[PDB]
């Protein structure tokens, strides 16, 4: 409380010093010289506890921390020096925590356009740890986003930036965070689905995630990649160029194999993708028949899981109509 007020006053003071410099541009303020990183570090730690977050919010923690992140990004840009990367990481982690389950904070952070642009820009940092933090913030912000937040997230180009980021990531942990954010964003509107589809090599990458080989033995990447694909497949359904990319990477074959999974999320995602792709395309309709999709989806209609019963029934009904010749 007392220490929390002290740390936030330190951060606000530094921000004010930086805004004074920005307008005057008197030497450039360096974060090291003001011990700023230890300050956000402690605030990052405390923000994991619910009651500390409550105090932090009453002291305007979201404003101070978001504003610190923003100003450092504007001042130094995409720098590689350890101190600035670490500073931005801690700040972004605290913003992740402060936006978790907080309706007001999600909407407020989205309305801060300058900070939103700064966040999105950090996805092209060659620090994957930083990339992972930025994706985590965007994941929370896109979860149950109101009308205004949905618009803002779209306008700052967060969808394209995350998809482009995903193609370049070398670490599984960065990719988890990136795909989770995209999973949320891909459900927002048609424009967001189009932006994913329009990125060069993105659809092939997404089909690639369906057979991903996790060495942490998780299903996270298959689930989220398949989740994104399920969301965008409604757009793919009416686009022959997009269907062809899926055909070249054996997508339908994999989706059928996904109906055998023990993960209910994977089955659900597969059912939804097959639901979209079984509509209005004789070529893919025939292929699904040839692969035995009818009997496979027949097993899942009486499922106790709501989306599996619905998705599998919707797909089957699209196959029962549009019967290919025996």
């Amino acid at each position: 409380h007392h220490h929390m007020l002290h740390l936030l006053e330190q951060i606000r003071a530094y921000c004010e010093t930086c805004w004074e410099w920005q307008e005057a541009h008197n030497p450039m303020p360096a974060p090291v010289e003001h011990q700023i990183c230890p300050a956000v570090c402690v605030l990052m730690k405390l923000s994991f506890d619910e009651e500390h977050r409550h105090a932090m919010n009453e002291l305007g923690g979201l404003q101070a921390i978001a504003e610190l992140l923003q100003v450092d990004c504007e001042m130094y840009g995409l720098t590689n020096d350890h101190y600035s990367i670490t500073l931005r990481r801690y700040a972004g982690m605290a913003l992740t925590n402060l936006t978790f389950g907080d309706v007001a904070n999600k909407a407020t952070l989205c309305s801060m356009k300058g900070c939103m642009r700064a966040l999105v820009a950090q996805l092209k940092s060659e620090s994957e740890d930083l990339q992972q933090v930025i994706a985590s913030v965007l994941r929370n912000l896109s979860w149950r986003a109101d009308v205004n937040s949905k618009k803002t997230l779209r306008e700052v180009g967060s969808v394209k930036a995350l998809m482009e980021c995903a193609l370049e990531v070398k670490k599984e942990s960065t990719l988890k965070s990136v795909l989770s954010a995209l999973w949320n964003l891909s459900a927002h509107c048609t424009e967001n689905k189009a932006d994913i589809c329009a990125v060069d090599g993105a659809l092939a990458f997404l089909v690639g995630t369906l057979t991903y080989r996790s060495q942490t033995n998780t299903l996270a990447i298959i689930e989220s990649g398949g989740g994104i694909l399920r969301n965008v497949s409604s757009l793919i359904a009416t686009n022959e160029d997009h269907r062809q990319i899926l055909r070249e990477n054996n997508c339908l074959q994999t989706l059928l194999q996904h109906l055998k999974s023990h993960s209910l999320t994977i089955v659900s995602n597969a059912c939804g993708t097959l639901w979209n792709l079984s509509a209005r395309n004789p070529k893919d309709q025939e292929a699904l028949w040839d692969m035995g999709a009818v009997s496979m989806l027949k097993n899942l209609i009486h499922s106790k899981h709501k989306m599996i019963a619905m998705g599998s029934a919707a797909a089957l009904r699209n196959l029962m109509a549009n019967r290919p010749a025996k």
């Binding site: 923000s47 990481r89 936006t99």
Partner: peptide, 13 residues
Amino acid sequence: GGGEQLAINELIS
């Protein structure tokens, strides 16, 4: 969906 989460995955190992 991807849901929401605390910054637990970003904690240093």
